[PDB]
Amino acid sequence: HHHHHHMVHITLDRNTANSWLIISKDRRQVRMGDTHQNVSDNKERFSNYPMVLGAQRFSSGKMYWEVDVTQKEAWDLGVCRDSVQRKGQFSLSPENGFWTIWLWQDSYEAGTSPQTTLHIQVPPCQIGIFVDYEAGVVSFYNITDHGSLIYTFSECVFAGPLRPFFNVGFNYSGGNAAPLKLCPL
Ligand SMILES: CCn1cc(NC(=O)C2CCC2)cn1
Numbered sequence: 001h002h003h004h005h006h007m008v009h010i011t012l013d014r015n016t017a018n019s020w021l022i023i024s025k026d027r028r029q030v031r032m033g034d035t036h037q038n039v040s041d042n043k044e045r046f047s048n049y050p051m052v053l054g055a056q057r058f059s060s061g062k063m064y065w066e067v068d069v070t071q072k073e074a075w076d077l078g079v080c081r082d083s084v085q086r087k088g089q090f091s092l093s094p095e096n097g098f099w100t101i102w103l104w105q106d107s108y109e110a111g112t113s114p115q116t117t118l119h120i121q122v123p124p125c126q127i128g129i130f131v132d133y134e135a136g137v138v139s140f141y142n143i144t145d146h147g148s149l150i151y152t153f154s155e156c157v158f159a160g161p162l163r164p165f166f167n168v169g170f171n172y173s174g175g176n177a178a179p180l181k182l183c184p185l
Contacts, residue, residue: 001147003130003139006064007185010054010164016044016086017052021168024179027055031179032171047087054164057082063131065164066143068181069103070125074169075180076102077127078111079138082161099138099153100165101127110140110151118151126183131162143183 011027019041022033032050046052058079067077081097084090092098092111100111101118108118120142127150128141136156142148171177 001128001130001139001141001149003062003064003128003141006062006130008056008063008065009185010056010065010182012166012182013044013053013055013163014039015042016046018046018050021050021052023052028182029179030166030168032168032177044086048089049167050169051076051165051167053080053166057161057163058131058133059161060133062133064128066126066128066183067166068126068179068183071178072103072169072180073173073176074102074104076100076111076165076167076169077180078129078140078165079131079162080165081159082163094153094156097159098165099156101140101151102167108150110153112153116151120150121145122148124150129164133158133162 012023019036019039020033023030078100084097092100093113108120110116122145124142124144126143128143130139138153140150166180169176
């Protein structure tokens with residue numbers, strides 16, 4: 001791909017984070033803590049899952065960023081509406097305001113309804129995410145495999161401002177403690 005020149009500097013929004021997440025000083029890394037991280041509750045925090053939003057809001061243009069997923073067993077990545085549900089149980093779908101892919105139990109899937117199997121020969125260590133607001137496109141790229149396409153959501157109905165979306169996943173296994181990291185430009 002040739003989307004690198006739309007690179008944007010993403011930072012994480014602490015106020016949206018599940019109360020167990022630990023965000024680095026530079027707001028570029030996030031991991032699951034082993035306990036509640038001693039913050040007050042608020043209506044923005046994702047309550048049920050280890051999710052957090054980027055601070056940036058996008059309503060036009062083309063945007064690109066990269067995320068490091070090295071040695072994780074489970075994670076979700078993509079974008080979502082600013083007004084997505086924060087509390088209780090929900091599925092990641094375009095109907096609910098999410099455009100995402102994930103790793104779960106050694107398989108990669110796109111968050112369609114129902115979910116779509118992805119075909120990845122080289123397990124990615126870094127994922128590129130491209131958003132074209134006007135075109136209604138969200139695309140995912142395998143940076144480990146020379147930028148190869150993973151998945152394209154087209155005919156997207158954003159219906160609001162978009163925010164970068166992250167889920168570090170649970171760590172029931174003891175094998176999923178590693179962080180998500182926003183990679184430098
Ligand atoms: C909540 C509004 N809404 C949006 C959609 N569909 C999409 O965004 C497309 C991406 C692939 C299907 C369905 N309902």
